[PDB]
Structure 1
Amino acid sequence: LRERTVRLQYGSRVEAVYVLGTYLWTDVYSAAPAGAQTFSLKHSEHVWVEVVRDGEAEEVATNGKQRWLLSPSTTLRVTMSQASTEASSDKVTVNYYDEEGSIPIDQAGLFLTAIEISLDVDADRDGVVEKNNPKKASWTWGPEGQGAILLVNCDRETPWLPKEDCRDEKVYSKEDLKDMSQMILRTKGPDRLPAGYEIVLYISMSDSDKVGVFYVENPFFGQRYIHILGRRKLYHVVKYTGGSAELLFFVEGLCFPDEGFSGLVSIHVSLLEYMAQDIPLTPIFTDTVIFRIAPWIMTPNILPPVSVFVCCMKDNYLFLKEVKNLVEKTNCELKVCFDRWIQDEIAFGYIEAPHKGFPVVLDSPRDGNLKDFPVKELLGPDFGYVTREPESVTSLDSFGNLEVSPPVTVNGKTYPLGRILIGSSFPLSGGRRMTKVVRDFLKAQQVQAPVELYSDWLTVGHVDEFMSFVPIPGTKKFLLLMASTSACYKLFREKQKDGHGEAIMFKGLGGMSSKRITINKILSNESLVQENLYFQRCLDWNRDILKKELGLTEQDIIDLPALFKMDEDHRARAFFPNMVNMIVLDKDLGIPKPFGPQVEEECCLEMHVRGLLEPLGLECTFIDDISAYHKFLGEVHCGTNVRRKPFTFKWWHMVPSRR
């Protein structure tokens, strides 16, 4: 119990509200007539009174005759365990006596109205709002941790509105409330608060753009939703009802954790006392709850697939047919839009709270040269949206440059949600780097602990050009897949030795035929050999940082043959389609068709890749996205992205490193 100072008043009796969970220390000396010697006291049945002399306390009966010497160091401790009702007269009365005679010379009194006031949230994270969790004012990480969680309400309930639900101060439909965390103000007391008191809910100016709080009224003509705290509303005076009462509120987050915002917000209720005109009201009692806003979490390739989103031209038939075929071997749904934007402009992620969770799309920054407008078209009920706006964005801001590992353990530290991977350039290089605003956002989510890789040796500059992850069927394990030019050169040299040097690349692509590219022609190009040795140095630098930061050994890695060509900037583009960027649906892999040299009427790259993957139980389907274009220049014209189930592990059970 918290101790509160309430003094009797020289002359006038004192009337005070007492909040359960506190107790009063009471000065009886200041109220005594000068020259009074001793005091006695009476009290009612529901008021417990102790006389405290220099720290030693003595319980006192309701009607006794006992007297004590008046001293500033002799005081009362006053405690009540139950709220007042209308039938209550709760009081303590003190009588004062002079030296001569046992009849009181004066009297001072304290008239009490006891009320219960508690602002309650689901701090124990079970989805139900418990009564006054002792830990509700704190937020701690881990399995044993406590404190309440809030979703950014970033989806859209109502289609005609252009923006996410949280962009305004209004609630249109009851469905919206299911995305919100419940907060209950529980009170117990008599019919009315005594004169001069009111109960007020409030938030800080700083948090006013992080939350909104709604109350549901049920007036005559239907249910309505009142915005009581949030943008440009810092406080709300609460209408008090007597007896045992509860007021239910619904709380939405407006903003994800970011640079300069930890994700923690607070809401308070105070009992205020009116003093006089032109004087602030005094906060007699204050109760506080904390919320943490849930982070955006990215889903790695190893999580179960739900939906496969695909963008291509209407007429790329082979691609559509083969992708349809692949998805039909799974339980996934196929969604087609008739152009890589679904892959480059969108990162699929999710948010979760004990009471609810939904997928959330992160939308890549607009440059204004290429992407003028944001992509909001996926925004819908229980499909959320978030974006960050930097200046000047480069290709490394594309989300082909954003990947996430499966759960890993590194030097004994666990990353149960995996770690986000972002391509970058060397510190002293003066090269390209993802914009600070996006990097800061990803870092602030904290639970995926991002790692920067080296992508800037590639023309386009995305990590998805050189690496991916696949699960190992029938196990809990996974593999890192790396592009390898050394594997490609070894394979082509073997085929040449075997008498296949005249085997031709790009068979069936009519726009490449005049080039007549053979194994011999590739192996005899000396400058191309040197370029690819250099690109292998770039791959191996990444291999090392991945082994270090993901805790991987060589046993966890498979190398897929790849080949690149250098541009004027000494950066790489694919010579033939990059097989590492593949659709991963559990055991079934859609792999870009390489169009490699035919040996015995089978592509030697396809056969080699099958020989690497199939023994592990992975099933390979090669998907041709380039035939419709008759040639391959290093560009990919289709994109896919897979929306997956969230991790079973709850993010709040993690313990991220101290910042």
Structure 2
Amino acid sequence: LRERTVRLQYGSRVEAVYVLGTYLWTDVYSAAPAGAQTFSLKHSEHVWVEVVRDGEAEEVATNGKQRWLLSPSTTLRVTMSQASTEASSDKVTVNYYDEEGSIPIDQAGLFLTAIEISLDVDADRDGVVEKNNPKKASWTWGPEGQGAILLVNCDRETPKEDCRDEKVYSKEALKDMSQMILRTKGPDRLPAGYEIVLYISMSDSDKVGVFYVENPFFGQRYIHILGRRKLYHVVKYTGGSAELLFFVEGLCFPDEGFSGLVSIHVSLLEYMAQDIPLTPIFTDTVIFRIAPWIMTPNILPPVSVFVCCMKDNYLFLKEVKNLVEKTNCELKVCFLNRGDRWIQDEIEFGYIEAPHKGFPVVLDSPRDGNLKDFPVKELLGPDFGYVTREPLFESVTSLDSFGNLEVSPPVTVNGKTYPLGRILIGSSFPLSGGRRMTKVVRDFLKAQQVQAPVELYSDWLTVGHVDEFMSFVPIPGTKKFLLLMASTSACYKLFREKQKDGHGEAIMFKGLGGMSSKRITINKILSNESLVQENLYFQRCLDWNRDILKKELGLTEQDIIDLPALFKMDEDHRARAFFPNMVNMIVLDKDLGIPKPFGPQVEEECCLEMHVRGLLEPLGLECTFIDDISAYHKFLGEVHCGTNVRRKPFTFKWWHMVPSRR
């Protein structure tokens, strides 16, 4: 399909390599002796030759005596369909004649060696490397889209991430890598003056690495041939039909300034002379897209439940164990220097996938320098990946914690489907001068593209995390889900009812000895005027979020349930929980671990517990209240335990999505 110029040379024979999949146009006029009138040609059996006059092509016999007028506009088109062997003589010979006489006055010739060269990848995304996919040089989204996929190699095979260096050790490691095969066919050797070279751009050199596995005498060997500080590698040619197998790894996720696309080239180079660069004769290119980091909403099947707490919080552990035992999930428990909530706050479970393989990958929250410096690498291991983003000049705040990072179930909004859901992060109003998650992390999340992030307003909360006020739960037995929203108005309605009912003296925080002297009742709560005003204002903040969520997630009031909540304002005019926030809950399918609220007791049951059950249970959701605060004897608005659930990936393949143009 590609036409290449090869001219005959005046008086001299021309030798050239012909690469299958191309064809030659050949000027015979320049090589004609002065005074020459006509020309004739001969060619071998495996070379097809057409005489082309002003676009009109005529195929010519191997030995014709046919003669044509010499003209600038009369040329040859030369095609070969099969590679040369050692038995080949592939040639075209042109004879020139003058006016008088039929014996040639000169001859010019073209001697050819045909070879096949193809750099192949699995562009059709079935896990196997197909021969020369015509689409391998581009990358397109969607069910009909094409082009190869590369995984960041962020995990660790042998006890930093595998991609932090240029070395490969074990065979298992190669499984994380995408295969790329250089397929060639030809005679025993390349003709003099040619070589085959693999290469990448300087820019891509920190995005990829390429290894070749050789099996020498003493064992299998993995050579790093392209990557950081290696931009090119000269390939050893072997004749006949040969394949060279390479393994490719990504070193970097998509990010600000990096689309995720990288390229690898192979060229056939021709030696000209000393001090003169080699001419690329033929170049073949493949494109990879590096797979994005993807999060998991609460609707996806749970795999493992991770929790952190102090060794002596017994009730919490017994109750979490009890909950998980109702499911098929496994429980993992940890008791680190600091960060009581760290499992929830310092890490987010996500995954990467390619047609041939995938695995969970953990994102690590930025280090402030006050509490967190040490990264959490304790979870870095085989087929568990690690990644992080550290701000250069920007200060870290509470909004950088991953309690502030969540993701919605799959949604359709204005007719646009988001099959992986949408990432949600808390922020402050634009003109507010308030807190915001660091740009480096926001940029990262935006760059993954397939979760199309949305900013909510969390800055009205002292801690500032979206998970304080909202969560999602599946509706059992269906494909649907609900948004759960904290509501102060719901709490006040409930307490006002219980007061009307004669329960005004009902006490909260029963069993927390450090709260006893405060003697906090429903009456005491309802009679506090400033607290009412604080909570009206917090309800306005919640409702502003409700409106953003309904708009950006395509939700109606039918999709939302309000859970009673209550806050107290701090000196910064931000909210901290008055009693534990029930909305932040462990969701394992139909089973919900719900923080125990310690609300007013009516007839020896917590009226907050009974109210939540009455909302959820009719939907087939099973509620277990989990007490994380008793071991501390009081609740000041902070929770000292954390949980994070690792989930199965979406069955929808990310590469089948079609994100909006950026």
Q: TM class by shorter-chain length?
A: over 0.9
Q: What residue number does 2:606 align with?
A: 603
Q: What is the CA-CA distance between 1:472 and the residue it aligns to?
A: 0.3
| Cα deviation code 1:12-31 (max 9, x no counterpart) | 10000000000000001111
Distance (whole Å) between structure 2 residues aligned to residue 53 and residue 598 of structure 1: 100
What SS class does the counterpart of residue 127 from structure 1 fall into? coil
Q: What is the CA-CA distance between 1:585 and the residue it aligns to?
A: 0.3
Distance (whole Å) between structure 2 residues aligned to residue 411 and residue 70 of structure 1: 67
Distance (whole Å) between structure 1 residues aligned to residue 218 and residue 186 of structure 2: 31
What SS class does the counterpart of residue 499 from structure 2 fall into? helix
| Cα deviation code 1:322-367 (max 9, x no counterpart) | 0000000000000000100000000110000000000000000001
Distance (whole Å) between structure 1 residues aligned to residue 169 and residue 23 of structure 2: 44
Q: What is the CA-CA distance between 1:642 and the residue it aligns to?
A: 0.3
| Cα deviation code 1:369-392 (max 9, x no counterpart) | 110111011000000001001030
2:200 matched to 1:199?
no
| Cα deviation code 1:62-89 (max 9, x no counterpart) | 0010000111111000000000000000
Give ranges in structure 1 of 5+ residues lacking alignment.
Answer: none
What SS class does the counterpart of residue 482 from structure 1 fall into? strand
Distance (whole Å) between structure 2 residues aligned to residue 12 and residue 637 of structure 1: 87
Distance (whole Å) between structure 2 residues aligned to residue 607 and residue 411 of structure 1: 38
What SS class does the counterpart of residue 550 from structure 2 fall into? helix
Q: What is the CA-CA distance between 1:151 and the residue it aligns to?
A: 0.3
Distance (whole Å) between structure 2 residues aligned to residue 257 and residue 192 of structure 1: 41
What SS class does the counterpart of residue 357 from structure 1 fall into? strand
What SS class does the counterpart of residue 370 from structure 1 fall into? coil
Q: What is the CA-CA distance between 1:183 and the residue it aligns to?
A: 0.3
What SS class does the counterpart of residue 633 from structure 1 fall into? coil
| Cα deviation code 1:247-267 (max 9, x no counterpart) | 000000000000000000000
| Cα deviation code 1:172-206 (max 9, x no counterpart) | 10011000000000000000000000000000000
Q: What is the CA-CA distance between 1:425 and the residue it aligns to?
A: 0.1
Q: How does 1:331-342 map to 2 (within 5 A)?
A: 331-338=328-335, 339-342=340-343
| Cα deviation code 1:264-321 (max 9, x no counterpart) | 0000000000000001000000000000000000000000000000000000000000
Give ranges in structure 2 of 5+ residues lacking alignment.
Answer: none
Distance (whole Å) between structure 1 residues aligned to residue 305 and residue 387 of structure 2: 20
What SS class does the counterpart of residue 196 from structure 2 fall into? strand
Distance (whole Å) between structure 1 residues aligned to residue 41 and residue 415 of structure 2: 66
Q: What residue number does 1:128 align with?
A: 128
Distance (whole Å) between structure 2 residues aligned to residue 330 and residue 311 of structure 1: 19
Distance (whole Å) between structure 2 residues aligned to residue 386 and residue 109 of structure 1: 60
| Cα deviation code 1:103-122 (max 9, x no counterpart) | 00110000000000000000
Distance (whole Å) between structure 1 residues aligned to residue 325 and residue 388 of structure 2: 33
Distance (whole Å) between structure 2 residues aligned to residue 217 and residue 372 of structure 1: 41
Percent identity of equivalent pairs: 100
Q: What is the CA-CA distance between 1:412 and the residue it aligns to?
A: 0.4
Distance (whole Å) between structure 2 residues aligned to residue 355 and residue 590 of structure 1: 36
Distance (whole Å) between structure 2 residues aligned to residue 541 and residue 210 of structure 1: 41
Distance (whole Å) between structure 1 residues aligned to residue 206 and residue 37 of structure 2: 59
What SS class does the counterpart of residue 323 from structure 1 fall into? helix
What SS class does the counterpart of residue 177 from structure 1 fall into? helix
| Cα deviation code 1:88-109 (max 9, x no counterpart) | 0000000000111000011000
Distance (whole Å) between structure 2 residues aligned to residue 100 and residue 12 of structure 1: 24
Distance (whole Å) between structure 2 residues aligned to residue 198 and residue 487 of structure 1: 76
What SS class does the counterpart of residue 530 from structure 1 fall into? helix
Q: What residue number does 1:461 align with?
A: 464
| Cα deviation code 1:393-426 (max 9, x no counterpart) | 1000000000100000000000000000000000
2:370 matched to 1:373?
no
| Cα deviation code 1:601-639 (max 9, x no counterpart) | 000000000000000000000000000000000000000
Distance (whole Å) between structure 2 residues aligned to residue 586 and residue 429 of structure 1: 38
Q: What is the CA-CA distance between 1:11 and the residue it aligns to?
A: 1.5
| Cα deviation code 1:435-464 (max 9, x no counterpart) | 000000000000000000000000000000
Q: What is the CA-CA distance between 1:125 and the residue it aligns to?
A: 0.1
What SS class does the counterpart of residue 409 from structure 1 fall into? strand
What SS class does the counterpart of residue 188 from structure 2 fall into? coil
| Cα deviation code 1:503-553 (max 9, x no counterpart) | 000000000000000000000000000000000000000000000000000
CA-based RMSD of the aligned residues comes to 0.4
Distance (whole Å) between structure 1 residues aligned to residue 59 and residue 563 of structure 2: 83
Distance (whole Å) between structure 2 residues aligned to residue 276 and residue 435 of structure 1: 55
2:442 matched to 1:439?
yes
| Cα deviation code 1:210-241 (max 9, x no counterpart) | 00000000000000000010000000000000
Distance (whole Å) between structure 1 residues aligned to residue 442 and residue 184 of structure 2: 45
2:312 matched to 1:309?
no
The TM-score normalised by the length of structure 2 is: 0.99
Residue number among 477, 481, 489 corresponding to 1:478 in the alignment: 481
What SS class does the counterpart of residue 10 from structure 2 fall into? coil
Q: What residue number does 1:240 align with?
A: 237
Distance (whole Å) between structure 2 residues aligned to residue 54 and residue 650 of structure 1: 51
Distance (whole Å) between structure 1 residues aligned to residue 479 and residue 300 of structure 2: 11
Distance (whole Å) between structure 2 residues aligned to residue 277 and residue 32 of structure 1: 30
Distance (whole Å) between structure 1 residues aligned to residue 356 and residue 324 of structure 2: 32
Q: What residue number does 1:178 align with?
A: 175
Distance (whole Å) between structure 1 residues aligned to residue 520 and residue 465 of structure 2: 27
Distance (whole Å) between structure 2 residues aligned to residue 140 and residue 104 of structure 1: 56
Distance (whole Å) between structure 2 residues aligned to residue 363 and residue 11 of structure 1: 70
Distance (whole Å) between structure 2 residues aligned to residue 488 and residue 70 of structure 1: 98
Q: How does 1:289-308 map to 2 (within 5 A)?
A: 289-308=286-305
What SS class does the counterpart of residue 535 from structure 2 fall into? helix
2:274 matched to 1:271?
no
Distance (whole Å) between structure 2 residues aligned to residue 582 and residue 651 of structure 1: 28
What SS class does the counterpart of residue 228 from structure 1 fall into? strand
Distance (whole Å) between structure 1 residues aligned to residue 390 and residue 640 of structure 2: 26
Q: What residue number does 1:496 align with?
A: 499
Between the two proteins, the alignment pairs up a number of residues equal to 656
Q: What is the CA-CA distance between 1:594 and the residue it aligns to?
A: 0.2
